[PDB]
Amino acid sequence: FSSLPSYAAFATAQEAYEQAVANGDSEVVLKKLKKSLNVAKSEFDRDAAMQRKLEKMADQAMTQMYKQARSEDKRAKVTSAMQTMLFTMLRKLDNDALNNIINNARDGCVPLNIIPLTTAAKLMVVIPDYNTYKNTCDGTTFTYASALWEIQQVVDADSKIVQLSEISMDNSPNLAWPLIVTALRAN
Amino acid sequence: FSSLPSYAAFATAQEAYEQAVANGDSEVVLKKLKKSLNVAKSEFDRDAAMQRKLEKMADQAMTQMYKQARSEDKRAKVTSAMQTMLFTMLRKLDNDALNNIINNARDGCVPLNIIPLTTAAKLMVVIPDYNTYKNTCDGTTFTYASALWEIQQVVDADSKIVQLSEISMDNSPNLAWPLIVTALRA
Amino acid sequence: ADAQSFLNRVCGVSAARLTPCGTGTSTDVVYRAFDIYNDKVAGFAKFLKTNCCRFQEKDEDDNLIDSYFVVKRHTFSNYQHEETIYNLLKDCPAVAKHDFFKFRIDGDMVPHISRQRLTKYTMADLVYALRHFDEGNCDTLKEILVTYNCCDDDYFNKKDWYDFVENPDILRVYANLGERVRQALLKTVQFCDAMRNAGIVGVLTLDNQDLNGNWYDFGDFIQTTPGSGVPVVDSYYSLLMPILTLTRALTAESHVDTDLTKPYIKWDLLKYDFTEERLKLFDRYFKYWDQTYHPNCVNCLDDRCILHCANFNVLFSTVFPPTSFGPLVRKIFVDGVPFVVSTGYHFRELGVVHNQDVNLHSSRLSFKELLVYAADPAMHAASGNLLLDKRTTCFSVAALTNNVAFQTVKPGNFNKDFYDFAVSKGFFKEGSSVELKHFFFAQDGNAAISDYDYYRYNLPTMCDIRQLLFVVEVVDKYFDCYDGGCINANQVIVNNLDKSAGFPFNKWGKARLYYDSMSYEDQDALFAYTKRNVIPTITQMNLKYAISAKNRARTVAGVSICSTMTNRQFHQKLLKSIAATRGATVVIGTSKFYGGWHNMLKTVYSDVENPHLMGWDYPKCDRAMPNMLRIMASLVLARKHTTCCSLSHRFYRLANECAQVLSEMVMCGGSLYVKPGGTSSGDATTAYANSVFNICQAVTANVNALLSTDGNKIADKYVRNLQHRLYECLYRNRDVDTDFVNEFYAYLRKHFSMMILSDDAVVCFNSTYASQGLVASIKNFKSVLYYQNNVFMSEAKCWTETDLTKGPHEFCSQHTMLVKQGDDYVYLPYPDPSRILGAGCFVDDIVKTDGTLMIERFVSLAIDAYPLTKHPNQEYADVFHLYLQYIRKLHDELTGHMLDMYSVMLTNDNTSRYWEPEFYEAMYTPHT
Amino acid sequence: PSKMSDVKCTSVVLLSVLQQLRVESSSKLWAQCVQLHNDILLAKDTTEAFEKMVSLLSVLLSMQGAVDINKLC
RNA sequence: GACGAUGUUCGACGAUGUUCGACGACACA
RNA sequence: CUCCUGUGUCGUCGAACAUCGUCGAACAUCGUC
Ligand SMILES: [Zn+2]
Ligand SMILES: [Zn+2]
């Protein structure tokens, strides 16, 4: 706190006031030394408070700079995550079926709802009752979306593998519904 | 507020100021005693405010730690306090079916499926001994959950179906005796 | 005798076996529905037809069939005029025979006109029966349904046969009239062509057409030069339109040769345009509707043109395959790597719309491009498996994973200390008024999809456009006192920055991450990009874990961060100006504390003369809300952007709102479904679009109540002129009459006061007018909901209060009670005591059971439960006193625990205010 | 109090206890438990809520998780 | 230059009030 | 690895401003010598 011009004036005025009070002279000079001690201490408190203000400004700058060094980190992390996800889901995407149905359109613009309907190589059927199963996925192969699918790995609501022989009319109250049938587009 | 060093200064200043205003002195004496009280009271307000801030921060940091400890205790003692609460308030209901079921299940006669409510639904309960079988069942009727059930078949541990006239005091040690009985609600 | 001679003359030449239905004079049929407009009366009401003498025809076996020989007895001038006008249109096949003749009735040659073989009812009768529906007075509708083999009386024997939610087979029963209505439309077009070729000018009304299609009553027709005739078909088509989708009139257009006895048309699977088909459908059924129809609403001229053409598109889109709507993907090469991204959209209402900034062959992706490419459902659906979900009837796009997710809800946590305290204070006894009714209900894995399946209540609803684009003007007048427009990214006030960011952005952070990662320039660039492109996003449904009185699951819809981020900049200025205005109709942002409830109530009651109160509800408000009314709400909200956005910017913002909130792809479970319509819970402007829809339905009920009364019996001349001009501004005027819009708005605000919050309303209406039929009653709301919302509003959920000293029976789940508060009588809102006790006893977290950590919880519950202390029922006040005593006990035991666990006091010198009613009492008094 | 409020609160506590024992990992059992709980909470007659409480408690006692002689000591 | 008097000037402190911000909780649509 | 939008109130903490008071201390004016 001694790095200010008014701190030296404060120390000097204090020393002069002490040398005066060690003698006890007349009040005409004593009061003037008290006034000088004021001017010193007043400018001292002024510049010290200004020093506190500037130190708090520096602290605010430090926090604002420690927050940007984390906002940029988070931005880079989420950018990497997003584009990794895009480039990853794109590898199970590009094939000849998609490039075949797109090249048949008027201007390469097809609806989205027919991309999995005509290019997906795996179906998933969720079946609530047994009559729905009997009318939908009876047998090992069935027909949906103008294709021919090949049942494999039918599971239940608990994600336990159900065998094709357990799905009967009498055993249906013994297994947890719905069943999630997985199929593969037969070539 | 009385233990700080400023206590003596402020007290002496206030006492001298009252004693001087009670005297009726000149105008300079009033202002000088007011000056003494001024500086004393000001420094006292200063360190008293410091103490108030310190004590408020202390109380805040204490109550935060208390809340943390209690929250951790609540989240840790769950799954062991919920069960004792459940049984405490199940004993208080004092029902004739729930108490029967609890007593059987604490003796060993636990069910194997949900106890049905319809007139022709199947119930399978385990029976671990003969004396447990002796008081719950006579002849064909099987009393469980304060209701009559009619036995269909009784099996042994190895699913060897046994009849009813074979379960007796002398014939008991010839089995493994987790007999799963079956019955429908009468 | 004379009657027998008259009968033989009425037969004439045809082999008609007639029986005298009624007698040999006028029959005076009981209350047929007419659509009249002359210098005295105007409206679509039920009048008393009295100048006909009908004879019913019987075939062999002498059993009666549905063909009548209506014989009129009008004067000579009209006789010759109708004969002259009929000798021209006679060649048309859409014209009933007429057989003009003269018969000596009393001695002197009375001239008669005998239209031949016409059905008991007309098309106006069908339209009035289906539009003004009364569940206990629908004899004409039953007779029409039975006569044409839609059903049989054993169908009406059951309960709720009319309901759309319960018994949704009434949809099939109605759709059994579709081919009849469609043949009527074709015969109307034939008649219009004959009128044009013969040079006839006249107004086509609904009441001059059989339920077969044949036309008659050429009374007000004027002859002109042949080839230059002009039919007027505004009222006809407009009154008819709401039943073109109710009865599925154009179902036969999905078949090969447009007949129901043939297979469906196997549309090309890659086809998405369907514009020539829409123009063909329009020119085939609505040929003489003389207003330009834009199949693609991107070419429209303003928002009224958008509403018009979108109405027609929502009719015509029921013919095309459902796999041809949704985003239009396209192969994009991002640095030699082929993407599949959305470069358009095909709406059921807005036609086809293409993105303007589509850049094939990119090099690198910035942050906003990564956002718009990770938010599209194109890359997520093109890469996932197919899916056939047999649990719903909603269209399922794809499964994003290899297995389905079955999400459950847990029960609540019992707060046993509060319950023990309550039962020690004498609560929860046998036969008590205050009992526990609000619990935490648990759900199993089949709850999310069973709650998503309730979107089956959103059916394609075509609206009466000529009245919808007048109701929209009156609603816009209701929303004039606000200030809206676009704002920059640095003016947006976002609260709760740590909430989820939708799908897929919730894999990487909350909304804080995406609001800190994007500079203000990135957000401004994204917003300015959504004004030239459509960004389809994905919402996420997930079950709600809260306390309620019904055991039905509750889902919430988490919309993405792109959609919310840009909708905020679009709408937030207007939304804040709505929430910061007091004294208006939409009481959003008005508090109930500090005398706010009293102020709201005193504002509703403002100046009504014979005031009654009234309140209704919308069954399945969010599932069943039609798409036309949601588009109308969006346009009314966006009408504030008259200087910041051009016309194309506003259209592309509307397209984005639709593609993101109205008909987006919903991820319910781990699979993408197609949402048919409704409202997304998590949309930025839900509580305000709901208010616009509420006011729209109320104004529609009012115009239906005023136009459907006999204008000959309105005793007041002012209201009679107002009804005349209302009809003339609906169906005879194409432009906007701002003077009459202001006049009707003033009429409503004076005789029908409203207090609208999101789908919750209270009305203080003039009871004398509502009894005479000059403002809306509850039956008018029931009718309007039936035909414009596809729900049946049961009058057991509505209420009515004739004594204003008791407030509304319920508003925002609060009851109202007039109490004395310091020489003044004020209205105070009190809750349901079961709700407060349930919030006390059952919590949703194990730490909220401790109590001492959660004293502010009970302070807030006691703030809400204070006004119960003014109730005349003693248990209601005991609720509040119980909460205060429990707060005191909690403070005592917290102090004990702090003194024992630690060793320091915690007086706090200020916690004694919560034990005493002064705090809570001052919470309900005006500030100063 | 009344024998109804106690039954509803006990059914809440009982389904909590069951959920902590990982019954949610059985579709059929959890569906039945949820049905019984939601039916006890909406019940009006005390003589049927007790039957559904019997059924739910029997779901709990058929397992082997909760040591029953120590709880009911 | 001193004496007395008022007020102007900053800083610390106390309080009140105002407004904004962060966190927690409750209710409603 | 899940919990949306909006509104409104309460509680705790922090910041800024204004007023008053506790005051410490410079002096700008007046009267006198
Ligand atoms: Zn248009
Ligand atoms: Zn704008």
Side-chain angles (χ1 to χ4, degrees), chain A residues 4-5 8-9 11 13-14 16 20 22 24 26-187, chain B residues 4-5 8-9 11 13 16 20-22 24 26 28-186, chain C residues 1-903 905-928, chain D residues 1-71 73:
Chain A
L4 275 298
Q14 197 282 320
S26 85
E27 58 80 29
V28 300
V29 174
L30 169 140
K31 207 170 51 74
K32 286 182 103 162
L33 316 183
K34 309 311 141 191
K35 295 151 142 204
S36 192
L37 172 56
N38 172 335
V39 188
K41 186 144 303 183
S42 277
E43 184 76 289
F44 157 79
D45 187 288
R46 272 179 150 82
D47 62 44
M50 180 223 75
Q51 172 277 349
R52 269 97 148 183
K53 309 251 182 172
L54 293 179
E55 192 275 333
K56 205 47 57 194
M57 201 79 107
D59 195 359
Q60 292 312 75
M62 177 178 190
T63 313
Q64 184 74 269
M65 288 313 87
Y66 277 22
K67 216 169 279 162
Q68 296 276 9
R70 264 181 288 109
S71 299
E72 300 325 286
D73 187 340
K74 289 158 38 185
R75 157 148 181 162
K77 187 165 138 66
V78 74
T79 291
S80 288
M82 287 198 300
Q83 73 180 357
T84 287
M85 179 198 72
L86 282 186
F87 282 58
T88 284
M89 65 174 69
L90 174 149
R91 283 200 262 94
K92 70 193 68 167
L93 166 58
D94 184 10
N95 43 6
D96 262 358
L98 170 76
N99 187 27
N100 198 338
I101 76 168
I102 281 175
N103 293 171
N104 267 324
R106 284 167 293 193
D107 55 354
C109 203
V110 297
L112 168 61
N113 304 331
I114 70 167
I115 293 291
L117 188 65
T118 77
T119 64
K122 184 148 69 182
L123 178 70
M124 278 180 36
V125 189
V126 191
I127 293 158
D129 310 322
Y130 171 78
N131 313 78
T132 298
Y133 183 93
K134 149 188 294 183
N135 297 140
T136 313
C137 318
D138 182 40
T140 304
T141 64
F142 62 102
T143 293
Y144 170 77
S146 291
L148 191 69
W149 308 89
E150 172 100 1
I151 290 185
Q152 55 162 51
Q153 183 82 354
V154 48
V155 302
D156 60 349
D158 309 326
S159 67
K160 315 272 151 204
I161 302 99
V162 165
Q163 304 295 151
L164 267 298
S165 63
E166 305 182 14
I167 308 158
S168 50
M169 184 69 255
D170 61 355
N171 195 44
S172 66
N174 283 11
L175 51 85
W177 293 94
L179 307 176
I180 299 102
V181 184
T182 307
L184 284 178
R185 190 187 293 270
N187 318 275
Chain B
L4 309 95
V21 68
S26 88
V28 191
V29 178
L30 320 182
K31 78 153 181 183
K32 74 151 301 173
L33 275 296
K34 213 174 191 224
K35 173 86 147 282
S36 177
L37 170 63
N38 277 19
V39 72
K41 184 185 193 301
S42 292
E43 177 270 310
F44 181 84
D45 180 38
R46 192 76 33 103
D47 48 359
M50 173 60 178
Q51 202 56 286
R52 273 154 57 204
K53 183 213 63 73
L54 211 68
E55 281 185 21
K56 195 173 81 42
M57 291 206 328
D59 284 351
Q60 169 175 358
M62 174 164 94
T63 198
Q64 213 85 50
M65 202 163 47
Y66 165 83
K67 290 194 193 319
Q68 199 46 250
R70 298 281 281 189
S71 287
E72 290 320 324
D73 190 351
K74 292 295 289 187
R75 284 162 190 151
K77 282 330 181 281
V78 76
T79 78
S80 177
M82 203 80 85
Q83 305 187 1
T84 190
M85 171 200 297
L86 159 69
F87 274 96
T88 282
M89 60 200 323
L90 260 172
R91 184 189 46 89
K92 202 192 315 161
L93 280 175
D94 191 295
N95 199 23
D96 218 347
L98 295 175
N99 278 124
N100 177 26
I101 294 188
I102 293 291
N103 296 142
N104 291 119
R106 90 191 299 273
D107 273 348
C109 182
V110 306
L112 283 182
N113 65 330
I114 301 193
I115 284 176
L117 307 170
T118 81
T119 315
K122 203 199 55 174
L123 165 82
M124 301 169 292
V125 309
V126 188
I127 290 187
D129 198 281
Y130 169 59
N131 47 8
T132 287
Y133 173 90
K134 184 173 45 47
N135 50 19
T136 182
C137 202
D138 55 42
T140 318
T141 59
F142 177 65
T143 291
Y144 192 74
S146 90
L148 275 303
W149 310 70
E150 301 145 0
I151 291 181
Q152 302 320 289
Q153 60 152 350
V154 193
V155 312
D156 205 350
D158 56 16
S159 179
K160 188 96 72 162
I161 175 177
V162 306
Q163 304 294 139
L164 279 71
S165 72
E166 319 158 322
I167 306 299
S168 67
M169 182 45 157
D170 59 59
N171 214 355
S172 90
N174 316 309
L175 286 76
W177 264 108
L179 312 185
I180 296 91
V181 310
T182 297
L184 311 97
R185 175 180 276 268
Chain C
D2 190 339
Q4 173 63 35
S5 46
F6 190 29
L7 204 168
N8 299 119
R9 188 53 205 87
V10 165
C11 303
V13 305
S14 44
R17 302 270 314 286
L18 295 184
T19 190
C21 165
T23 183
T25 191
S26 75
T27 189
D28 190 316
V29 306
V30 281
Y31 283 81
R32 297 285 183 263
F34 291 95
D35 169 23
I36 65 170
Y37 170 82
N38 43 17
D39 307 358
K40 315 182 101 154
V41 198
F44 187 38
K46 258 191 167 179
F47 300 88
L48 192 81
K49 195 44 150 32
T50 174
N51 63 326
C52 64
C53 168
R54 286 133 65 84
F55 302 83
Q56 183 165 17
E57 174 197 40
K58 64 187 105 157
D59 59 15
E60 69 84 22
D61 286 331
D62 288 331
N63 57 29
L64 309 176
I65 63 173
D66 195 42
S67 68
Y68 298 65
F69 280 59
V70 186
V71 179
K72 214 167 55 189
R73 294 196 188 201
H74 222 309
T75 172
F76 195 100
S77 48
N78 189 85
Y79 167 86
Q80 259 183 336
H81 175 70
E82 283 212 3
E83 184 161 57
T84 284
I85 299 293
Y86 168 74
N87 278 5
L88 312 179
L89 301 169
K90 163 164 58 180
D91 316 278
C92 201
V95 160
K97 304 280 310 312
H98 270 247
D99 184 58
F100 308 82
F101 66 91
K102 280 181 174 181
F103 197 70
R104 167 165 275 102
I105 281 295
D106 199 57
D108 50 357
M109 280 313 87
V110 179
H112 300 245
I113 302 181
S114 156
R115 40 202 71 82
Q116 296 185 352
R117 281 178 174 89
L118 62 80
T119 288
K120 198 184 184 178
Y121 299 114
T122 47
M123 288 279 295
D125 279 282
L126 168 65
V127 170
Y128 191 95
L130 275 185
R131 275 177 65 128
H132 308 254
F133 183 79
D134 194 2
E135 49 99 20
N137 214 316
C138 54
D139 298 300
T140 289
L141 183 55
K142 291 173 167 185
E143 189 153 0
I144 289 186
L145 290 177
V146 166
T147 317
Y148 304 111
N149 302 164
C150 312
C151 63
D152 53 357
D153 308 77
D154 307 358
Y155 198 85
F156 316 131
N157 263 7
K158 71 175 72 175
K159 54 172 280 164
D160 284 307
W161 65 268
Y162 40 69
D163 208 339
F164 280 131
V165 191
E166 276 86 42
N167 181 60
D169 190 72
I170 199 59
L171 262 55
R172 189 259 303 160
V173 165
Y174 285 153
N176 271 291
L177 287 149
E179 191 71 16
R180 186 158 293 267
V181 169
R182 185 187 144 267
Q183 300 293 332
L185 279 173
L186 299 174
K187 295 254 195 73
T188 300
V189 181
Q190 297 195 47
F191 191 53
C192 278
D193 276 354
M195 276 174 55
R196 177 178 54 81
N197 295 343
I200 304 282
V201 192
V203 182
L204 298 202
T205 43
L206 273 163
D207 48 301
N208 294 137
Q209 167 160 56
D210 306 355
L211 269 159
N212 281 336
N214 306 315
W215 284 87
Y216 52 93
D217 197 297
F218 323 112
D220 299 279
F221 281 19
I222 283 303
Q223 197 182 336
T224 310
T225 81
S228 87
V230 64
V232 182
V233 287
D234 264 14
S235 44
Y236 178 90
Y237 284 125
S238 278
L239 291 160
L240 184 66
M241 283 189 287
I243 80 164
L244 295 184
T245 44
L246 204 46
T247 67
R248 296 169 187 164
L250 310 195
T251 296
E253 292 275 343
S254 316
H255 294 249
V256 163
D257 264 357
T258 313
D259 57 344
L260 295 155
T261 52
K262 274 205 178 182
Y264 287 72
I265 310 191
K266 257 60 184 171
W267 283 114
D268 186 14
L269 191 62
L270 270 62
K271 185 179 167 54
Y272 71 87
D273 214 350
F274 295 118
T275 292
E276 308 309 313
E277 277 71 52
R278 286 182 151 117
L279 291 171
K280 284 175 204 159
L281 281 171
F282 191 86
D283 184 88
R284 178 192 259 158
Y285 295 108
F286 305 88
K287 183 178 185 184
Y288 281 85
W289 184 269
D290 65 334
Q291 185 172 337
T292 60
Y293 162 63
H294 306 111
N296 302 320
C297 288
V298 76
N299 325 303
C300 286
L301 321 172
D302 50 355
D303 55 356
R304 296 167 59 85
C305 201
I306 286 188
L307 277 185
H308 170 269
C309 311
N311 212 53
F312 278 113
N313 283 353
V314 82
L315 168 67
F316 296 148
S317 301
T318 60
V319 169
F320 310 137
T323 70
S324 83
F325 302 98
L328 311 169
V329 305
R330 166 178 299 192
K331 214 166 197 180
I332 289 307
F333 291 94
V334 174
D335 187 275
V337 177
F339 273 42
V340 177
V341 307
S342 298
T343 80
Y345 209 101
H346 182 191
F347 298 91
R348 304 193 182 249
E349 302 96 13
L350 302 186
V352 191
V353 48
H354 290 292
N355 287 181
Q356 318 199 67
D357 312 324
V358 181
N359 47 13
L360 289 64
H361 295 105
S362 159
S363 48
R364 284 156 291 109
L365 291 177
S366 44
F367 201 69
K368 63 156 289 276
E369 308 185 51
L370 279 185
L371 284 193
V372 308
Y373 285 173
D376 284 10
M379 284 294 286
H380 300 268
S383 88
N385 315 330
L386 191 46
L387 175 86
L388 169 61
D389 200 312
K390 284 295 176 185
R391 305 176 284 169
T392 62
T393 42
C394 305
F395 199 76
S396 43
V397 175
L400 308 187
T401 45
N402 292 113
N403 55 7
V404 188
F406 297 93
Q407 182 209 9
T408 65
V409 174
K410 306 191 293 180
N413 287 272
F414 185 44
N415 187 3
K416 198 197 193 321
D417 187 19
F418 181 65
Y419 182 82
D420 285 353
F421 191 79
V423 307
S424 88
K425 293 307 167 188
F427 266 77
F428 307 131
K429 275 166 165 43
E430 308 91 5
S432 187
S433 304
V434 181
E435 69 183 49
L436 285 178
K437 278 160 166 24
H438 297 243
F439 304 96
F440 270 85
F441 288 98
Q443 315 289 338
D444 49 335
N446 308 315
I449 199 70
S450 309
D451 192 84
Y452 174 84
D453 198 21
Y454 289 147
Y455 276 117
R456 64 187 190 257
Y457 298 140
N458 193 277
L459 314 159
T461 295
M462 203 188 187
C463 277
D464 180 10
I465 199 61
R466 274 323 170 206
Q467 91 171 2
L468 173 65
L469 52 83
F470 170 84
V471 167
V472 77
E473 306 307 313
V474 181
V475 178
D476 179 33
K477 278 287 297 172
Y478 265 92
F479 282 86
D480 260 350
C481 44
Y482 307 133
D483 163 64
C486 304
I487 60 184
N488 295 322
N490 53 72
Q491 317 179 40
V492 169
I493 302 159
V494 49
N495 54 3
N496 270 335
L497 212 45
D498 274 315
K499 302 292 195 176
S500 89
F503 187 77
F505 303 113
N506 57 25
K507 310 173 175 183
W508 312 302
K510 333 286 281 183
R512 195 184 293 283
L513 164 65
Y514 304 101
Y515 268 106
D516 301 351
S517 311
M518 306 188 76
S519 44
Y520 288 154
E521 280 66 59
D522 284 276
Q523 305 182 24
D524 284 336
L526 178 63
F527 181 46
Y529 167 87
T530 74
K531 300 181 180 172
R532 315 182 87 233
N533 303 73
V534 189
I535 310 175
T537 69
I538 293 170
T539 78
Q540 207 193 30
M541 303 267 290
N542 41 12
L543 292 167
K544 201 188 159 190
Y545 179 43
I547 170 168
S548 80
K550 294 173 301 304
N551 66 311
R552 212 190 47 80
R554 283 167 318 176
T555 48
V556 309
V559 182
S560 287
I561 198 63
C562 276
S563 158
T564 43
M565 172 171 305
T566 66
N567 274 30
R568 283 198 182 110
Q569 290 187 233
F570 198 57
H571 279 307
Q572 208 197 70
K573 189 173 171 194
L574 165 68
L575 301 196
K576 301 283 194 174
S577 198
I578 291 186
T581 292
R582 279 87 176 95
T585 301
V586 183
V587 290
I588 292 189
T590 307
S591 180
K592 69 187 173 97
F593 303 108
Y594 306 109
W597 196 262
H598 182 71
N599 291 345
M600 293 195 291
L601 292 198
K602 275 301 179 181
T603 305
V604 189
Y605 299 2
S606 74
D607 276 354
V608 191
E609 302 255 20
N610 303 269
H612 287 191
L613 292 151
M614 188 192 67
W616 59 93
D617 73 333
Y618 299 92
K620 315 267 175 308
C621 186
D622 54 356
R623 306 304 167 115
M625 181 161 167
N627 285 7
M628 284 303 298
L629 303 189
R630 188 51 170 91
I631 287 167
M632 185 268 318
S634 279
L635 294 178
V636 162
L637 292 192
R639 193 166 287 185
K640 297 289 164 195
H641 305 242
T642 52
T643 42
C644 48
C645 296
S646 87
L647 187 65
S648 177
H649 294 96
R650 281 156 81 175
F651 174 79
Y652 270 95
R653 291 293 331 164
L654 167 75
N656 283 287
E657 289 188 65
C658 284
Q660 294 168 4
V661 160
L662 186 67
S663 55
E664 79 281 6
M665 292 202 181
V666 168
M667 177 182 162
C668 166
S671 318
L672 285 175
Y673 301 88
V674 177
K675 167 178 160 184
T679 62
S680 282
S681 155
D683 180 15
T685 75
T686 298
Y688 307 88
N690 269 345
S691 299
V692 186
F693 156 83
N694 215 354
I695 302 178
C696 165
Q697 300 276 259
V699 177
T700 291
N702 278 269
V703 303
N704 284 23
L706 189 45
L707 269 189
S708 89
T709 60
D710 195 340
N712 283 304
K713 290 162 171 37
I714 300 190
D716 205 351
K717 184 193 60 83
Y718 172 76
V719 179
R720 201 190 280 123
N721 299 5
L722 197 144
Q723 168 202 45
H724 186 90
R725 290 150 73 208
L726 171 58
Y727 181 98
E728 171 199 326
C729 288
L730 287 201
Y731 299 117
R732 295 300 184 106
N733 222 30
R734 193 139 314 165
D735 295 330
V736 184
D737 196 359
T738 52
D739 282 88
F740 182 77
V741 167
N742 298 351
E743 179 165 329
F744 196 71
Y745 173 74
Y747 174 88
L748 281 190
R749 256 185 69 97
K750 160 73 180 181
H751 299 286
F752 200 79
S753 278
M754 281 190 268
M755 175 167 56
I756 305 283
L757 204 148
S758 156
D759 74 27
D760 206 324
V762 162
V763 158
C764 179
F765 62 95
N766 186 326
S767 87
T768 288
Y769 276 13
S771 89
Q772 295 175 13
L774 310 176
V775 297
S777 317
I778 288 178
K779 64 159 198 175
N780 287 118
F781 279 92
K782 176 162 58 180
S783 317
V784 168
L785 269 69
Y786 199 75
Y787 88 86
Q788 217 181 33
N789 217 319
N790 306 308
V791 300
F792 177 77
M793 188 193 73
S794 183
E795 288 162 318
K797 318 269 296 189
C798 322
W799 52 267
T800 306
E801 182 72 31
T802 82
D803 187 15
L804 257 63
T805 70
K806 277 81 71 177
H809 166 84
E810 189 208 20
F811 180 64
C812 278
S813 278
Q814 315 286 113
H815 307 258
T816 290
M817 176 185 38
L818 180 79
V819 303
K820 171 160 188 310
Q821 196 153 68
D823 293 298
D824 273 318
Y825 282 87
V826 294
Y827 298 102
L828 289 195
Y830 63 92
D832 199 19
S834 298
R835 178 59 177 80
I836 311 299
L837 288 184
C841 306
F842 306 106
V843 303
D844 72 277
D845 195 359
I846 192 50
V847 305
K848 291 170 181 166
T849 298
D850 194 359
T852 81
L853 322 172
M854 290 292 178
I855 315 185
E856 46 177 339
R857 206 182 179 280
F858 293 94
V859 169
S860 303
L861 293 164
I863 285 174
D864 286 294
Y866 171 76
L868 291 171
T869 195
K870 306 288 189 175
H871 212 269
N873 193 5
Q874 190 59 218
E875 301 148 22
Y876 284 21
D878 291 333
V879 176
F880 173 68
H881 297 150
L882 167 85
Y883 266 94
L884 257 56
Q885 300 185 315
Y886 190 58
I887 294 166
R888 176 183 193 112
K889 145 169 185 156
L890 277 187
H891 261 296
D892 281 359
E893 89 184 28
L894 177 142
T895 297
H897 285 177
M898 296 289 288
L899 206 170
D900 282 8
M901 175 179 309
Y902 302 80
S903 184
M905 294 315 178
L906 190 63
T907 74
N908 288 319
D909 208 339
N910 213 17
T911 60
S912 315
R913 56 197 285 204
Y914 309 124
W915 317 341
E916 300 142 5
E918 309 299 327
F919 180 72
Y920 319 98
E921 164 179 340
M923 201 72 42
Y924 281 92
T925 56
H927 263 296
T928 294
Chain D
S2 65
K3 284 299 187 182
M4 200 64 205
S5 290
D6 282 351
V7 160
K8 301 182 171 184
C9 297
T10 318
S11 79
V12 168
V13 179
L14 201 158
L15 193 61
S16 293
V17 168
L18 279 178
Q19 187 267 342
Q20 289 162 1
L21 294 178
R22 281 161 153 170
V23 181
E24 277 186 313
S25 79
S26 197
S27 176
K28 268 195 304 173
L29 209 50
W30 180 248
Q32 302 190 251
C33 295
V34 159
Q35 189 76 288
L36 291 166
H37 163 97
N38 295 351
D39 283 348
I40 293 173
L41 298 195
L42 294 162
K44 306 292 232 314
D45 199 11
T46 316
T47 59
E48 61 155 30
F50 269 119
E51 310 186 290
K52 301 168 175 305
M53 264 296 296
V54 163
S55 283
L56 204 40
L57 188 52
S58 77
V59 181
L60 164 71
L61 292 165
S62 63
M63 327 175 86
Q64 301 299 334
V67 51
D68 205 81
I69 302 93
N70 274 47
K71 297 303 170 192
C73 84

